[PDB]
Design a protein around this ligand. Structure first.
Ligand SMILES: CS(=O)(=O)c1cc(Cl)c(-c2cc(Cl)c(S(C)(=O)=O)cc2Cl)cc1Cl
Lengths: 68, 68
């Protein structure tokens, strides 16, 4: 799952549209499910710039939190 | 990283607030980084109900996509 998911990590924060949904193509998200992923991208293109590098530089401290 | 991250998966979609930030406590997200995680929760409490079970039932089809 690590590999199949980054194309969405960028299409989500480092993307704007077309790459996020097209990135979900290989995942063939259910109907509504995909719908939620589309808006998921909007919320990303609706925040400032620091909030962008933040959730991107934040999801790492929450998931891949270095240190112990 | 699989384990340390679900407390946020629920605090994010199955949560509203306090559990999401408090869930990031153990991850000690940087300053702004955490800021982005706070709004991250708002965007979740700002969508309908199907969009909620969707991104939750969607992030699985994108990441843990069954089948091949
Ligand atoms: C399935 S999806 O593509 O619609 C999706 C939706 C969300 Cl909310 C996140 C997400 C997940 C988390 Cl945990 C955070 S955070 C690092 O702010 O908690 C931010 C975001 Cl945008 C990630 C993805 Cl890939």
């Amino acid at each position: 799952i690590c590999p199949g998911f980054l194309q969405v990590l960028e299409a989500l924060l480092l993307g704007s549209e077309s790459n996020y949904e097209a990135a979900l193509k290989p995942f063939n998200p259910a109907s509504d499910l995909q719908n939620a992923g589309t808006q998921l991208k909007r919320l990303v293109d609706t925040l400032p710039q620091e909030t962008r590098i933040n959730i991107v530089k934040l999801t790492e401290k929450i998931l891949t939190s270095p240190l112990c």
